[PDB]
Ligand binder design. Structure first.
Ligand code: CL
Ligand code: CL
Ligand code: CL
Ligand code: CL
Ligand code: FE
Ligand code: FE
Lengths: 387, 168, 515
């Protein structure tokens, strides 16, 4: 047992004699000089802000001088060459959920433990007995399984973002977004593995989902888009915007919410809504942070807003076209489902697309000045609905 | 002799005055290329603004980038360098150059000069980053081959340093 | 059917999901790393720990709750934040904030390694580390946040993310634990971060810090750092798997041992002098002499056992290990001379060794008394601690021909005329600029890769400026705007102000002008 200065009598007396009898400064607010976004400086800001050691030649940095070690050739540890977008201060971003590591894992732990309690009870209840078998076996298992590859690809798009991005609050937003996406993929597979325990003959292998993702026309446009966002570019703002604010906000929201979640509740599926509840909660949390970065910080930067909008509008034109093509392919899946009027007929799909594109116009397009005719995009996708 | 303060000083102010006079993409591209050749890398022409050149370069980049978005067709922001060259053609030229390099000394200067001439906003970011990565792969492969094989005395001569002091 | 089903209670355990993770990646032409690299990590690489996202969060949240309970409930009730010996409370300003940058840059490094890998399992192992290094950034922040609230001197605990920029020891920390983690071939970065940084230094260092802390009355740092330590084995495993993943690439035999040797030299060049200085001079109560610790950590545990386990993948112990060991006897005492002499550029309050400390130094480092002990005692007699004295030892160094140089590669200071360590000065002029190097390994790095090593040093930035102006511009003051954060003693009276610094007239020279 080692002596400890807090409890050992001799050492505690020595320490007490050494400690001044008054405080040597009154400023007890950690990183008191951070500009607060809200009425009072938050713990999230105190623990996160200025952790990244940027010099004055990266907008907002408080340090000085060149980096100590660069890449062969001269690429800097972090640099302005990493993105087309420009700002007066890369540190400005704030996640409205104020997630540092602790609240992030605390919340996900709650979901982790509750999920296992729910599954143990759901299996004990026998509630799988009323699911439509064709939905379970031919649509959910195969095409919801295949969707895990979209989530997994969007996850991986964040690898270069996590390396390249230019501030601490942005890096946290990006990493938490990435983990939520791989969580979505893992949760889809968890659902399939659980069903396999309840339904003799139900195959939870990824072989069929992967074959569908990689070769079925229904996912051809989606996979092409994900491959481009992940591996076709390296501008870290382009990746976050294209991935979350265009592709996932249109194709991803349609597939998860309008197809799998919504149709689960017309085909007697009492299990899938528990899983889509998590992915949709994560989507809205991620959206809050993506919105702050791209709207408050970048599209409305006092010096570079118009410049940034020029790039954001160009990216949106391109990736919206890709996402429309992805949805046009995807709506071919309705040819395979049992008709339910108002849900799976052409008129029901039209209303679903009107929700996705109409919500997207308000939530993102309007905020960056991107003009979009909602009915045009709906009609373009419905051209893929089979007669 | 005596440095001015770090973040606000007469050298940075003088260069900000020069940058404010740039009015076209062509003019700002020549300005930034000349600046990077003159003041950046171990092969720069002058260390006269050493403690200020990185901040000044940032401000030139900002000026050129805004001139691009104000003056150029949007498609050119994706496919062209601000020199007017096709961006994929620039990539092809410089990859070919470094693949033909016969020594680490030829290769290092090719990579350095590519960055001096084409660092964003001159070349589009996505094209630049993938070209820079391809060049760095080749440069490292050459440099890291038999890395300890030349004695320091030989490396000093190959680099061309003037040796001013060697502690006994 | 609709009536019959097995109603046994079942869930899905994390390893049941992890079994399928490797199958989540798919083949396409562009599916390859974006970063420059000499190596290819094999597509079938596995990972040691079978952690999925939900389980990651469950396991880390449980550790957090125990840690934050101790800090915010128990230690606050005990008033423990002000029961730390002042020397150690000051040392923790530096240890926690400097380690914080390593935690922070390790996030980005681990993401670059996630990009470098093709196997989903190897990506996932690097991803766990990405998340852990965020956790650790906020944990180091929390230590200084807690000290800011509860310790008798919050200055410097409360603003190091800007005040660290004033001083020269910060530049060297950025080389080993910021730029060295992220700037280069991903495999070179992995050897700097995981194979050397973590397996050689961070893993034992985090624990040792807790032992020095508890010995000196600090129960805050053990609470946090002992929790940080539970995450580190996964990161060391990531480094092991980096080597496994490239072992069948012919490039590994060509290049890996060079990247490893360069990274080993990089890390030890800073930690060998700096850690021994912080432990031995930044403490009252002593745990173990640094010379003994270094040999156990670096030469025996790491260079012998831990690197030996990679012999089956072609890894050799670093060629520069013997040279590093030769410098570990006195390097931290040499650094102490520079740190005490340049105290006004720091953000911590220093204490010259007292009579009992001097006896400990001479017992464990015979020869210390006749060199460093006499120097420190002379500085005290000349007024080191006394703000009326106009005395700062950097000026004494210059007046007596003991110039301070900065290594262009490592940024570590060097005083050749007083050093008992093994460095030696080389000064070269290249293309109109002079450069000082201090050892054979770093000189080679600079000669081969000059464009990687263009860091401005404090003498170049501050040349000809007076010290109090530099400190004021850099915000190196307390909330009254005039009393320095840094001090040359740990007492509550006679604190130095900007005016006291100005009285000394310390103006920075160009140390290479003479050459
Ligand atoms: Cl500020
Ligand atoms: Cl079945
Ligand atoms: Cl010139
Ligand atoms: Cl041309
Ligand atoms: Fe860590
Ligand atoms: Fe670690």
């Amino acid at each position: 047992v080692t002596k400890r200065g807090l409890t050992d009598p001799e050492r505690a007396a020595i320490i007490a004699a050494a400690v001044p009898d008054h405080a040597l400064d009154t400023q007890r607010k950690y990183h008191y000089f951070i500009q607060p976004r809200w009425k009072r400086l938050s713990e999230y800001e105190q623990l996160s802000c200025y952790a990244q050691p940027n010099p004055d030649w990266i907008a907002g940095g408080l340090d000085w001088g060149d980096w100590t070690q660069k890449f062969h050739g001269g690429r800097p540890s972090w640099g302005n060459e990493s993105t087309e977008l420009r700002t007066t201060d890369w540190y400005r971003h704030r996640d409205p959920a104020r997630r540092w590591h602790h609240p992030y894992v605390k919340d996900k732990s709650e979901e982790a433990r509750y999920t296992q309690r729910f599954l143990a009870a759901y299996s004990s209840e026998g509630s799988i007995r009323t699911i439509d078998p064709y939905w379970r076996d031919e649509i959910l298992n195969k095409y919801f399984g295949a969707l895990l590859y979209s989530e997994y690809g969007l996850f991986n798009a964040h690898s270069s973002v996590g390396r390249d991005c230019l501030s601490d609050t942005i890096r946290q937003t990006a990493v938490f977004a990435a983990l939520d996406k791989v969580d979505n993929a893992q949760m889809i597979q968890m659902e399939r593995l659980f069903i396999a325990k309840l339904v003799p003959g139900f195959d939870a292998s990824t072989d069929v989902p992967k074959k569908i993702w990689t070769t079925d026309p229904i996912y051809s446009g989606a996979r092409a888009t994900v491959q481009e966002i992940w591996q076709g570019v390296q501008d870290w703002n382009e990746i976050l915007w294209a991935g979350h604010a265009v592709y996932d906000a249109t194709f991803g929201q349609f597939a998860r919410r309008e197809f799998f979640q919504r149709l689960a509740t017309v085909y007697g599926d009492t299990l899938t809504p528990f899983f889509t509840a998590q992915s949709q909660t994560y989507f809205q949390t991620t959206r809050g942070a993506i919105d702050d970065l791209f709207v408050y910080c970048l599209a409305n930067d006092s010096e570079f807003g118009a410049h940034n909008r020029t790039f954001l509008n160009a990216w949106t034109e391109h990736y919206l076209a890709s996402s429309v093509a992805a949805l046009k392919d995807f709506v071919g899946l309705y040819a395979k489902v049992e008709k339910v009027a108002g849900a799976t007929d052409r008129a029901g799909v039209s209303e679903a697309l009107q929700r996705v594109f109409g919500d997207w116009k308000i939530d993102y397009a309007d905020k960056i000045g991107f003009r979009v005719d909602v009915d045009q995009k709906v009609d373009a996708v419905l051209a893929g609905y089979k007669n | 002799a005596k440095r001015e303060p770090i973040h606000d000083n007469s050298i940075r102010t003088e260069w900000e005055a020069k940058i404010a006079k740039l009015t076209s993409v062509d003019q700002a591209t020549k300005f930034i290329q000349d600046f990077r050749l003159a003041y950046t890398s171990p092969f720069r022409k002058s260390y006269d603004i050493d403690v200020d050149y990185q901040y000044i370069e940032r401000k030139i980049e900002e000026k050129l980038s805004v001139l691009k978005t104000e003056k150029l067709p949007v498609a050119d922001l994706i496919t062209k360098a601000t020199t007017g060259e096709d961006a994929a053609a620039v990539e092809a030229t410089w990859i070919a150059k470094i693949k033909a390099a016969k020594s680490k000394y030829e290769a290092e200067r090719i990579h350095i000069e590519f960055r001096q001439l084409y660092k964003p906003p001159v070349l589009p970011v996505n094209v630049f980053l993938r070209t820079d990565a391809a060049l760095g792969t080749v440069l490292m492969e050459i440099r890291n081959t038999d890395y300890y094989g030349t004695p320091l005395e030989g490396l000093r001569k190959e680099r061309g340093v003037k040796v001013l002091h060697l502690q006994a | 059917d609709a009536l019959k089903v097995n109603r046994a209670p079942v869930g899905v355990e994390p390893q049941e999901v992890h079994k399928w993770l490797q199958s989540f990646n798919w083949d396409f032409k562009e599916n390859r790393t974006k970063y420059p690299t000499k190596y290819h990590m094999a597509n079938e690489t596995k990972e040691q720990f079978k952690v999925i996202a939900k389980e990651y969060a469950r396991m880390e949240a449980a550790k957090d709750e125990r840690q934050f309970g101790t800090l915010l409930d128990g230690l606050t009730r005990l008033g423990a934040g002000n029961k730390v010996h002042p020397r150690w409370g000051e040392t923790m300003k530096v240890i926690s904030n400097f380690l914080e940058v390593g935690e922070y840059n390790a996030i980005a490094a681990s993401a670059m390694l996630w990009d470098s890998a093709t196997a989903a399992e190897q990506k996932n192992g690097y991803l766990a580390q990405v998340l852990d290094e965020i956790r650790h950034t906020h944990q180091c922040a929390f230590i200084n946040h807690y000290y800011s609230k509860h310790y008798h001197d919050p200055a410097g605990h409360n603003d190091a993310r800007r005040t660290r920029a004033i001083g020269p020891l910060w530049k060297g920390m950025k080389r080993v634990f910021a730029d060295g983690f992220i700037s280069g071939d991903a495999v070179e970065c992995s050897v700097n971060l995981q194979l050397v940084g973590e397996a050689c230094f961070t893993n034992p260092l985090i624990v040792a810090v807790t032992e020095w802390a508890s010995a000196n009355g600090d129960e805050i740092t053990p609470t946090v750092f002992l929790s940080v330590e539970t995450d580190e084995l996964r990161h060391m495993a990531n480094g092991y798997q980096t080597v496994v993943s490239i072992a069948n690439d012919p490039a590994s035999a060509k290049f890996l041992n060079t990247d490893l040797n360069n990274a080993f030299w990089t890390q030890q060049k800073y930690f060998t002098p700096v850690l021994g200085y912080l432990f031995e001079y930044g403490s009252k109560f002593k745990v173990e002499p640094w010379v003994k610790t270094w040999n156990r950590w670096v030469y025996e545990d790491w260079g012998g056992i831990w690197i030996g386990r990679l012999g089956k993948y072609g890894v050799e112990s670093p060629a520069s290990l013997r040279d590093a060991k030769r410098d570990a006897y006195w390097a931290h005492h040499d650094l102490a001379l520079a740190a005490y002499a340049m105290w006004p550029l720091g953000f911590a309050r220093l204490a010259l060794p007292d009579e009992e400390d001097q006896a400990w130094f001479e017992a464990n480092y015979p020869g210390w008394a006749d060199h460093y002990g006499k120097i420190f005692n002379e500085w005290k007699k000349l007024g080191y601690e006394d703000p009326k004295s106009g005395f700062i030892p950097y000026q004494w160094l210059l007046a007596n021909g003991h110039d301070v140089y900065i290594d262009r590669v490592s940024q570590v200071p060097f005083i050749p005329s007083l050093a008992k360590g093994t460095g030696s000065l080389r000064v070269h002029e290249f293309n109109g600029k002079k450069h000082s190097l201090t050892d054979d390994w770093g000189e080679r790095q600079w000669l081969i890769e000059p464009e990687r090593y263009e860091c401005h040093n404090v003498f170049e930035q501050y040349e000809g400026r007076e010290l109090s102006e530099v400190i004021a511009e850099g915000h190196g003051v307390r909330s009254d705007g005039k009393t320095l954060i840094a001090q040359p003693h740990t007492r509550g009276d006679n604190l130095w102000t900007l005016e006291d610094i100005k009285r000394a007239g310390c103006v920075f020279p160009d140390p290479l002008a003479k050459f």
